[PDB]
Structure formats: C-alpha cells, structure tokens
Design an enzyme around this catalytic site. Structure first.
Site, short mmCIF file in Angstrom:
data_model
loop_
_atom_site.label_atom_id
_atom_site.label_comp_id
_atom_site.label_asym_id
_atom_site.label_seq_id
_atom_site.Cartn_x
_atom_site.Cartn_y
_atom_site.Cartn_z
N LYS A 4 -1.53 1.43 -3.49
CA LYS A 4 -1.50 0.51 -4.59
C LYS A 4 -1.11 1.16 -6.08
CE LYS A 4 -6.04 -0.25 -5.74
NZ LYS A 4 -7.26 -1.11 -5.92
N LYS B 166 2.74 -9.59 -4.30
CA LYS B 166 1.66 -9.40 -5.38
C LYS B 166 1.59 -8.01 -5.81
CE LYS B 166 -3.47 -10.10 -5.42
NZ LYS B 166 -3.97 -8.41 -5.85
N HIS C 255 -7.84 -12.89 -10.48
CA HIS C 255 -8.22 -12.04 -9.33
C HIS C 255 -9.39 -11.51 -10.07
CE1 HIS C 255 -6.68 -7.97 -7.00
NE2 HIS C 255 -7.97 -7.85 -7.29
N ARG C 256 -10.27 -11.94 -9.20
CA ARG C 256 -11.84 -11.75 -9.58
C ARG C 256 -12.29 -10.31 -9.38
NH1 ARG C 256 -14.42 -13.93 -3.97
NH2 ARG C 256 -12.97 -12.76 -2.62
N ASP D 222 -0.88 -5.09 -7.62
CA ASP D 222 -2.07 -4.85 -7.38
C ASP D 222 -3.07 -5.22 -8.61
OD1 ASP D 222 -4.69 -2.88 -7.45
OD2 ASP D 222 -4.77 -3.25 -5.31
N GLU D 223 -4.13 -5.71 -8.60
CA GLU D 223 -5.12 -5.87 -9.59
C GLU D 223 -4.97 -4.85 -10.74
OE1 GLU D 223 -8.92 -2.96 -8.09
OE2 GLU D 223 -7.29 -4.44 -6.94
N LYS E 222 0.81 -0.93 0.13
CA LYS E 222 0.03 -0.04 0.05
C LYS E 222 1.06 0.86 -0.02
CE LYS E 222 -3.61 -2.90 1.83
NZ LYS E 222 -4.03 -4.42 2.95
#
Lengths: 416, 416, 143, 136
Positions: free
Chosen positions: C18, C42, C134-135, C44-45, C16
């Site tokens: 993002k 990971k 990633h939904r 971020d989307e 964070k």
C-alpha cells in the site's frame, strides 16, 4: 570562535546531513585552519565569548570531516546538519555554501566541487518534470537522440525570415528549433509576433512530415516577462521553453519551475555565462555542481559538452557530468545532456558511441553549413544519426543519402 | 564568417553605442583573431555563405575598435550598435556580453572589465530609487556614515533571541540591524513571525532614543517569496530590504526593483557569491562591472570593501568601484558603499579619511566583540565615528566615551 | 449511470503493497487491474502525496492510462483517488481531478474531520465529483 | 507478507524517524504477530509474492522495536521512516497511525499512546502561534 572546532577528521555524518566537497589552497594557514574557516563561513560563521550564544547555534554547526591533500592543494568534504538551510530554497543553500566562502582572505583558491543532499533536503525538490522520459514521450522519439539547430547568424532575423529557415530546418528532419541564447525579443522580431508565427509553421510541418517538431524558444528576460512569455508559448502550444539559467539567475529559475509545472512546459537550460567560474580548476563552481543544483530544481535538458576536435572537452569530466544527469536519483527524473560544440554529419557515430542514444545533439553549424542549404543539412545529420545507431557505415549510409554523401565528401575539402 | 571583419582598430563609435572593455589572453590565435571572436560571439556570432543573410544581421554587428596590449595579454574595447539588445533587459545584455564569450576555446583567460551604455540604453533603467540621498533623508542622518551590524553568531537565533540583541545593538547607536546573508527563514525563526517582532522592537527603540533605526532584513529566496516577504516588510513598515544579488540571480533582481518601486523599499545588495569570478584577474567579471549592472537596475547600497589589515583590499580598485557608485551619472542616483571587513572603533578615522562620510560602515565584529557587551560596542563605534568626523583625537574622544576607551584600550591587548 | 453498470456490483482494488509506489509503477499496475475488468482503482487510505509520487504528477498520468483503457476495453473505468489532507489541498486537488476528468474522489471522513467534509460536499457539488468515504480511524469508538 | 518481518526487538531507530507507542491485547495471535500486524497496517500493509514490488516499498516499512508486556496486554513502540508521511499533513500521519490499525480483527483492544516526530517531520509545523507567551 576557533576555526578548529569546525574540524574533526574523525567524524561520522549521518544520513540526514548535507555534504559539500571542496577544493582549496590555503594562504597563510594550516590546511586545517583553511578548511576550518570554509566551514566557519558556510554555517554559524564565528564567535564563542559575550552575549547570550543562540540556542540552536550550537546545533546549526558545519564540520570538516575529511581533508586529504590532492594536487597542489587539498580536498575538504564538510558535512552540514539541516538547521542551516531553509529546505526547498536552493537559493538559500548557496548563500552558505557558494557565498563569502569564495572571498575569505585565508585561501588562494576555493572551488565547489559537488554536494549531496540527505532525502530530507532533496525530497523537497521536484526534479525534472519531463526528464528524458516525458520529453521523449511527447516528441515521439523512443530511440535516436534528439537533433536541434540554432540558425547562423545568431541575430537580427525578422519574424518573417525566421519562419522561413525554421520551416527548412524542421523540414529536413530537425526535431528542435533552438533560439540563440542572446536572441529574445527585438524591434524587428518582437516575442509575441514571433510565437504566433512559428507555432503555425511548426504545425504545418508536423502535417507536412508525419514527425514531431518543437522549438526551444527563448523566454530569458526579467521574471515577470519570462512568465508572461511562458504563458504564451503555452498558449499556442509548445511543450518547451529555453532559459539562460546562469544569466537569468537562481531564484528566478526556481520560480519558473513552478510556472512550467503549471503550463506543462519542458525547460531547456543554457549555461551561457558559466564559463565565469566553471572553468579555472582551482576556483569556482564545478560545471557538475551546477548541473546538479539545476537538475534538482528540474531542467529537462542541459548543455554539457563534447567529442569533437572543436570542443576538445575533458572527456572524463564531460562523461562525469553527463552520467550524472542521466543517472537515477530517487524521485528526481533523469536530465538529457545537450551536445553543443560545432558537431556535423560525420561526427555522429563516434559522438554516440561515446555518449549513448540519449542526447540532444545540437549542431547549428554542420547543418546551416551544408553546401546544399540548411534543409538538406538536416537530412544529413538525420541519416548520419539513423545510420550510426543501426550500425551502418557512414559511407554506406551515403550511398542511399545524397545530402549525407555531399556533407561527408564536403567536410573532407575543409581539413588538410 | 571571418573573425577579422569583427575588428577595425580604426573605427569610431558613436554616442548611441555600447562599449564593453575586455581583458584577455589568446590561445592559438592572433590577438586580433582572439578579440575578433570575442565580438563574433558577443553579437551576430558567425556565418557569411548559404541561406538568406537576415537583413538587420548585417547592422546587428559588434566591432573591436581598440586592442592595445596590457600586461601579459591585452585589453580589447568592442563597441555594440543597440539592435542587439532588448533595451531595459539587462539580463539579455549579459547573455551577449558575459555569455559563451567566457567559454570560447581560443582564449586562455577573458575578463569583463567595465561597460558603458549610450543614453538611449541607460535611459531605460531607473537607477537607485533612494540613492545616497533618499536613504539619507529617511533615516535622518545628514552627515556621518551609516552604522550597521550583523550579529555573531550568524544563525540559529530564535525569533526571540533575535529581538533582544537587536534591541541592544539599536540601543547603543546602531543605525542598521543587518541580517546575515545566509539567514532568511528557519523552523525557530520563521520570516513572518520575525517581522512582526523586530519592527515593534525597532520602533520601541526610536521612541526610547530619539534617533532612527532600520533593519536590512533578508528577503533572499525564490522570487515569489522574496516578493511575498517584501510585501510584509512593507507592511510593518520598513523602508529597507537586503537581497543576495549574486545568489538570487539577475532576472530576479530586476523584477524586485520594480516591486520595491511599489512598496517604497530601499534595496541593499550582498555580493555573497561573487568571489566566484570577481577575484581571478585574468578571467571573470570585475567587481566594478557588476557594481554597475547593479547600480543601474537600482540597488541603494552595495558591499565593496575596505581599509583594514583584515580586508588588505586593493585600495585602488576598492576606491575605483567606490567612486563610481558615488558619482553622477545622468538620471541614475548615487549608491552607498558598504564597508564590510572586520572594522572597529579605532579604524573609524582612517576608514573615513580614506572613503568619505558617505559610507555604510558595517562592523558586526568590533561591536558584538566589545568587552562590555554589544550594546556599549555600538556606543563605541558611534563615538569612534562622531569624534572622527569632528576632527577629534580618538584618545580624546575616549576621555568622555568610556565604552570608546575600553574598546581602544582592549583592541590594544589583541595585536603584539 | 455514469460508470455504466446497471446491474452487477462495482469492483475495486487498492494495490498491495500500500505505499511507496512511484508515479510510474502506479500507472502500470493500474493499467493491469483496469485491464482484467476492474471498475475502480482505489488508492489506499494512507496514500496521498509523496516525494516519488506527487499528487499533481499522479493525476496527470493515471487519467490518461484510465482512458487508454476505456479505449482499449469498451467498458468504463474510474479511480477513487485520495484527496485527503488539510481542506485547502483537498480542494485544490479536487479541482484537478475534476480537471483531467474524474467523476470520483476518495476522502477519509473520520481523519479529515467533519467540517471539512461538509465543505467538500459543496465543492464536489461544483465539480461534479462523487465522494467515497473511508472510515479509516472509526475503530476508535465505533467498536 | 510476514507480520514478523515487521518486528525486530533489537532494532535501533535513528534521529530521523517516527515513533508511535501502542497499547494492545492480541486476540488469537502471538504478542508478536499482533504488534507485527500493527506495523503491517500502519505502513506498507502486506504482500511479498506476484507483481513488481514498488521500489521504495521496501524503504517505506514500519518496525516494532520494543514490545515489553504491560498490564493485561503489552506496549509496542513501532518506529516509522519518513517516506511514509507527507510532511506537513498531520491528517495523513493519522491515516497510518490511527487508521484501520484500530479495526484489525487480531486485536481485542489497541490504544494510541504517544508519538515522537524526528526534527525533520516537526520542523514543518508552526507550533502555537502565541503560546503561553503571546497570549500572555
């Protein structure tokens, strides 16, 4: 159709607009109708009469929003709405702002001074790809400046002859072998046979020394070849390639950004040919304008100038252009300035002290010129710089560095 | 290491050597040591002292073999032995003769005047590929000059808007649609969607008329694209492509010669950006120097200049540069000069009479400007030229050509 | 098998804030995170490629940081990087992530689209790339 | 880290910015801290505390500049600075504005209503290729 509509000294231009500052001298026109015309030309040119006006013609206009007088002429600053460029093609940008604009009869003189790109125009340029940074990481030098030598004479060396003096130069402490702007490929030193050789010499020397060594080799020539030669330099492993940006051409540099993207090649530029316009102060294109177009596409070094009797170079301008190159600028990574100008062991401290440890000092002369031969000429220059940086008196350095002493002592026996 | 060895005013240079003529003004040097240095720089630079001199260094030298004084400075003529060039890479040629040569502190001013290539250097250049000839064959015009129009305004037209006015222009008798030097590709007129359109309009018009029509379209941009767009223009069938040689860059033109080799594409050049050096008469590169480098690589048209109050262009120089372009030259086929300069129906006879039926007259203005709309503006200009050529009094022509009358009659109502 | 964890669960962190991290800034905090014991970096989307952090310059960097950290630690470390974007690119970027060696690639299956995931199965077949989904966008109906 | 910084009902958004209008119903939050969060999520998410804040994080923020009430909930209109998109990838656009944004616990309902793209975002899209026109 009224060069005057193209001016409004009151206007305020937005974040998303393109500003070019000009230097000019009218020539049978109001300083307004001169600066009107500079933005007629650089954008929808003229006409407001016969056939259906193109929609977006109207929004594609350029506008003088400042024209104060300066020196024997004036400075306009014209601001440009992005519907006029093709983002990404800096080459197209110049057709409008470096075009016919220099031909227009109503001006005596017209010089391109600087330009600023709205994020929105510049977020489409990759900036250098290694910058002072990357370069710095890879050769292995975190603090000092980078040293590099073009060998004198500047041509006719053979593939062989070339290895030898290369070997010598790398061997006393030079960082960068530099080819000469002119030097590409010739019957007696063909490119391909050259690359094969030097690289191996290059490494033998890393092996021999403990330090890194690279070769700003000269891939200039029609794009095709420049590409083909880049793919080889990539092949034997060089993270560098020298290109004559002014010569070579614009469209062609571009393309090459991308290619070096690909092979992971650091570009070095050499303005050999710029003196054709970047000189005359009333007409042309400022060495800064250009150091910009080109830091933006992404060259990771450029020749700017110096602090030496030899290049008695406007230290205000030399330090402008420099400081820019080195400055933050969003996403664009910083460029290295290349200090060319017959420099030598004794000018080190002042050079430095006046332009930061972040320089690629290029001094072919002071090194091939050493009395003891090129390889102690590189020890010289090396020490001349370690001692500058660490504070130490050049005369002290000399007390431990003999090729430094004899180089200092010797450059004494040349000026009276 | 002696700028003087580089001079010998007595020397006689052989068939197989390269001569460049320079204009200069020293600046704290004998007119000999200035012109010495111009050939130090443009060839093995300096040094005769420390390390093994390169074999062929010695044979790679340049030599001033004439320096008379001319105007407030002098003219040298330096002759160059071919071991210094990489034959074929004109781009490398310039690094030596248009390089650092313009930066050298010992000159106040330095201008590249002209250059001659020994067969042996020039037999490696294809010359134009269509020349006045080929062009002439294909459009179908054996005698008159070629007419072509860039539409005003010069940007922001849409893919559509563009067809329409194209259609009009081709329709009154224009030969060549010309894009504007600035005009490539934009959100509202993307290249690909553009080509697809115009070409079809182009033919419909051949069909409609009985005459030929082409479009000097503007493929300028990074090489890759310039290539990619050339392959499309080739696709829908154009035997032409407009390129900003000065912008675009050298290396990049080269490559494109070859590509147009391939698709059978006639190049048109547009010097937009040259005014940055081809102007100042004491420094730079003569529009002729350049009209040469480039006829040699092979452009089949170039903008030179005119015979009109608007471009009050040195008719001695304009006719030099012209006459060259049109002249035999071995294997290199002749180029077409492009008459740009706000011209119009009434300047036809004098234009002609002063520069041969072999011109591409470009007059965007006089045509979009017709009172009756662009398409009668093309009838105008057409007639204005048929009648010039056939001897006929412009006032007579007008008696059968109404859009000619009203254009003549009208350009009357503009000058007082 | 590949990361090397037979028992515990796998740990992974999107940093964070993002967005707007630079190619650089990104290495650093990556380095830190891998360094205290995180398994998976990971993205971020939302985070793909931007002027200040371009994809290609990003991959080149992180991977090296990734390994330095394996070297430093003794443990494995991977980066669920975010190749979302039109298929072509998603492919082109997968071939690079494969290049510097990642056995992973994060994809926004709901965003990205179906036909497009498919194709990518096959591509990861090919490079030997583990997909992570990633939904982000599902909440439009799965709710 | 304050969903509130993400709102300012006074703000005026520039030509070169991206506006998305939303329909929503909070669910245990002020209609402000709901619409704050919709723009926390759709842009630099959260946090203003520990590690070096990313430069351009600060300029990558989204901002609610209108939230009137409409029907049994409200309409926000959040405006977005282009450093947040990858121009051209509309697919990336949606990850921020059609993402996790529909999952966030503080809303009962969230609907994407319409969006307007600044030239600068939309000049990177080809539009139809035939349109009513071409087809026709």
């Amino acid at each position: 159709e009224w060069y005057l509509d193209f001016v409004d000294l009151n206007y305020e231009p937005g974040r998303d607009e393109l500003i070019v500052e000009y230097y000019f001298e009218p020539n049978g026109v109001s300083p307004e109708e001169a600066a009107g015309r500079i933005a007629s030309e650089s954008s929808i040119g003229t006409w407001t009469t016969l056939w259906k006006l193109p929609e977006m013609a109207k929004r594609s206009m350029a506008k003088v929003f400042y024209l104060e007088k300066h020196g024997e002429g004036y400075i306009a600053k014209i601001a440009y709405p992005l519907t006029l460029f093709e983002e990404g093609s800096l080459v197209q940008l110049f057709s409008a702002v470096a075009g016919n604009v220099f031909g227009m009869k109503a001006l005596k003189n017209l010089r391109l001074l600087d330009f600023h790109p709205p994020y929105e125009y510049l977020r489409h340029f990759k900036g250098p790809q290694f910058g002072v940074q990357g370069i710095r990481e890879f050769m292995g030098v975190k603090d000092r400046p980078l040293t590099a030598t073009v060998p004198k004479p500047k041509m006719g060396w053979s593939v062989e002859e070339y290895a030898e003096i290369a070997y010598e130069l790398w061997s006393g402490g030079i960082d960068l072998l530099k080819d000469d702007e002119n030097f590409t490929s010739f019957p007696f030193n063909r490119f391909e046979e050259r690359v094969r050789k030097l690289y191996r010499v290059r490494d033998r020397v890393e092996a021999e020394t403990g330090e890194t060594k690279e070769y700003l080799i000269n891939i200039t020539g029609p794009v095709n070849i420049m590409e083909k030669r880049a793919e080889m330099v990539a092949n034997e492993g060089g993270q560098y390639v020298m290109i004559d940006i002014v010569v070579a051409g614009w469209s062609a540099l571009q393309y090459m950004r991308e290619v070096t993207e690909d092979l992971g090649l650091a570009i070095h530029a050499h303005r050999a040919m710029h003196a054709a316009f970047t000189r005359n102060p009333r007409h042309g294109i400022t060495m800064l304008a250009l150091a910009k177009a080109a830091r933006m596409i992404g060259v990771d070094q450029i020749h700017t100038g110096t602090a030496v009797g030899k290049m008695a170079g406007n230290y205000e301008e030399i330090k402008r252009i420099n400081d820019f190159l080195l400055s933050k600028w969003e996403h664009i990574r910083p460029v290295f300035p290349v200090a060319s100008g017959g420099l030598h062991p004794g000018l080190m401290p002042e050079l430095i002290r006046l332009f930061g440890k972040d320089l690629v000092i290029q001094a072919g002369g002071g090194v091939m010129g050493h009395p003891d031969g090129p390889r102690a000429g590189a020890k010289a220059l090396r020490d001349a710089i370690d001692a500058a940086i660490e504070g130490v008196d050049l005369d002290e350095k000399a007390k431990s560095s003999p090729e430094l002493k004899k180089s200092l002592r010797e450059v004494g026996l040349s000026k009276a």
